[PDB]
Design a protein around this ligand. Structure first.
Ligand SMILES: Nc1nc2c(ncn2[C@H]2C[C@H](O)[C@@H](COP(=O)(O)OP(=O)(O)OP(=O)(O)O)O2)c(=O)[nH]1
Ligand SMILES: [Mg+2]
Ligand SMILES: [Mg+2]
Ligand SMILES: [Mg+2]
Length: 539
DNA sequence: GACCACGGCGCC
DNA sequence: AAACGGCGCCGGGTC
């Protein structure tokens, strides 16, 4: 390309090199831009950010986030990763996309600008005639990238002192457990080593092996195995308690306080827009989509996620979302009616399965009923369903056959979906997001059947993801104008921050936007709550 | 130090 | 584990 002085004209494709992948923590090492046969390299990349009107190119969102960190309003625009990811969601990395669509991801910003420009040209070509994908790009993914840049740059407030204090208390309770385990073993070992634990449980204590591990065929020590073994020996209960505590401490209590950003005083995740096979977002560095919520200690952790002083969190979560989506996709008259009538399938299952009235169903029971309801739907075995309730291969199954014959268009929807996927090589969401599933004609039954469950799950999980993305795009500007913030997405949930005085109004508005995003054959209901912390805002 | 593959497990 | 799906982060062998 012809070498040309910095600054580029309007509409050029940017290339940029970061010291590390996380845009909130990165040093911008280099910046360049490409357009009309010319490449322009920035002498001083931070100053040079100020000359751009938008970030247009590979990983546009990440540069935008870095710009926002520096007080610049540089929105992301076209990004070939989003075009590629819509063509085939196994397109997840710039190395891969480049190789597939016409160049090489190098460590030079100029080359990255040039690559961005030519990959955009090519990928735009490939989306010719692909009207549903183009709609997804223009109406969902491209505008969503700007929303995600703001969310990443804004961050969430964390009660650091609370977590530090909690760490010290949890350390003591862990020592009590590990000491008991070692006493019961008759010797110490590394309790964090599942290989050492395997030897102790099954060789030294002679407990029965239940299951084997997937890749290397060891005797499993997983929670399902230990649960089965609870009454065999008192060590097993102590191992389960130890695992619960150490998981929480090593994954959340300890690391999160050290990730507070020195200039914002907040915690900044990354929302990865080209990372899943179904069209969901992911969250990393750290992951804020798997913050604990279920156990007593997990609830304590979730309490550390708090609002700015004088603000409240507003948590909004779609009710029974994949079930509603499935009603629409299958057009099943019975399931449509269940929702027309305001029923709750999770609560009904929980009530039935624990034998208590609906008013006695607690959050733990509701979570177990979800496992049941989504499990059966997405192809859980009669064998595992036996054990989950868990009662027997008698009335563990039969249950599947009734579940399905109640909703006869579901079976037909699955079979239509699978037969389409075999012929086409892909399945799709309501909006035409695609997932290629080639193993549908595999000849190893276990491989083929795994593929099938992947394949029919995707239109449901993926349509739910499309809806949430669209809600985000519609909701974001409404929040800006109200002086509220969008903080987190958790698949079917949004966490917002609002000034106390406006929090109620924000909650109503956000709820209505999410409920009316794209009407289906059943209502979408959203549960909304407000509080000083993320837990109180869902309670 | 960082890489991976694994088992394991947190959330949706 | 058990053949529900989708993720990302934690703590033996290698380089
Ligand atoms: N296949 C599968 N999908 C799940 C599972 N747990 C959650 N999901 C998917 C389906 C849910 O509809 C969606 C959102 O999770 P939620 O915990 O909000 O559940 P849901 O919206 O169904 O119920 P809610 O009324 O919000 O409690 O994520 C699971 O165990 N298996
Ligand atoms: Mg929900
Ligand atoms: Mg949810
Ligand atoms: Mg893994």
């Amino acid at each position: 390309l012809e070498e040309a002085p910095w600054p580029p004209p309007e509409g050029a494709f940017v290339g940029f090199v970061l010291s590390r992948k996380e845009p909130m923590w990165a040093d911008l090492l280099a910046l360049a831009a490409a357009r009309g046969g010319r490449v322009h390299r920035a002498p001083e990349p931070y100053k040079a950010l100020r000359d751009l009107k938008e970030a247009r190119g590979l990983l546009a969102k990440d540069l935008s986030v870095l710009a926002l960190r520096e007080g610049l309003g540089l929105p992301p625009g076209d990004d070939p990763m989003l075009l590629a990811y819509l063509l085939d969601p196994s397109n997840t990395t710039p190395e891969g996309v480049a190789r597939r669509y016409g160049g090489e991801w190098t460590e030079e910003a100029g080359e990255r600008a040039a690559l961005s420009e030519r990959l955009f040209a090519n990928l735009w070509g490939r989306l010719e005639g692909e009207e549903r994908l183009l709609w997804l790009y223009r109406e969902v993914e491209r505008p969503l990238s700007a929303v995600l840049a703001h969310m990443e740059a804004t961050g969430v407030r964390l009660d650091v002192a609370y977590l530090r204090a909690l760490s010290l208390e949890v350390a003591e309770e862990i020592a009590r457990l590990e000491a008991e385990v070692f006493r019961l073993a008759g010797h110490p070992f590394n309790l964090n080593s599942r290989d050492q634990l395997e030897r102790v449980l099954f060789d030294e204590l002679g407990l029965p092996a239940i299951g084997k591990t997937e890749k290397t065929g060891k005797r499993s020590t997983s929670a399902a195995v230990l649960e089965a073994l609870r009454e065999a020996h008192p060590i097993v209960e102590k191992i389960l308690q130890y695992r619960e505590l150490t998981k929480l401490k090593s994954t959340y209590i300890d690391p999160l306080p050290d990730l507070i950003h020195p200039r914002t005083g907040r915690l900044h995740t990354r929302f990865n827009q080209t990372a899943t096979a179904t069209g969901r977002l992911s969250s990393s560095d750290p992951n804020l989509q798997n913050i604990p919520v279920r156990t007593p200690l997990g609830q304590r952790i979730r309490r550390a996620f708090i609002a700015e002083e004088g603000w409240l969190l507003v948590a909004l979560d779609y009710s029974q979302i994949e079930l509603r989506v499935l009603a629409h996709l299958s057009g099943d008259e019975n399931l449509i009616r269940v929702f027309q009538e305001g029923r709750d399938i999770h609560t009904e299952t929980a009530s039935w399965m624990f034998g208590v009235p609906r008013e006695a169903v607690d959050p733990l029971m509701r979570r177990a009923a979800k496992t049941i309801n989504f499990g059966v739907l997405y192809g859980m075995s009669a064998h595992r369903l036996s054990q989950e309730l868990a009662i027997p291969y008698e009335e563990a199954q039969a249950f599947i056959e009734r579940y399905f014959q109640s909703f006869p268009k579901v079976r037909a929807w699955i079979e239509k979906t699978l037969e389409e996927g075999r012929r086409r090589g892909y399945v799709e969401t309501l909006f035409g997001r695609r997932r290629y599933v080639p193993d549908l004609e595999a000849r190893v039954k276990s491989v083929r059947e795994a593929a099938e469950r992947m394949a029919f799950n995707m239109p449901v999980q993926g349509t739910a993801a499309d809806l949430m993305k669209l809600a985000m795009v519609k909701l974001f500007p409404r929040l800006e104008e109200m002086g509220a913030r969008m903080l987190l997405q958790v698949h079917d949930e949004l966490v917002l921050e609002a000034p106390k005085e406006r929090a109620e109004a924000v909650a109503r508005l956000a709820k209505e936007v999410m409920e009316g995003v794209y009407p289906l054959a059943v209502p979408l209901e959203v549960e909304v709550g407000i509080g000083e912390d993320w837990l109180s805002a869902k309670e």
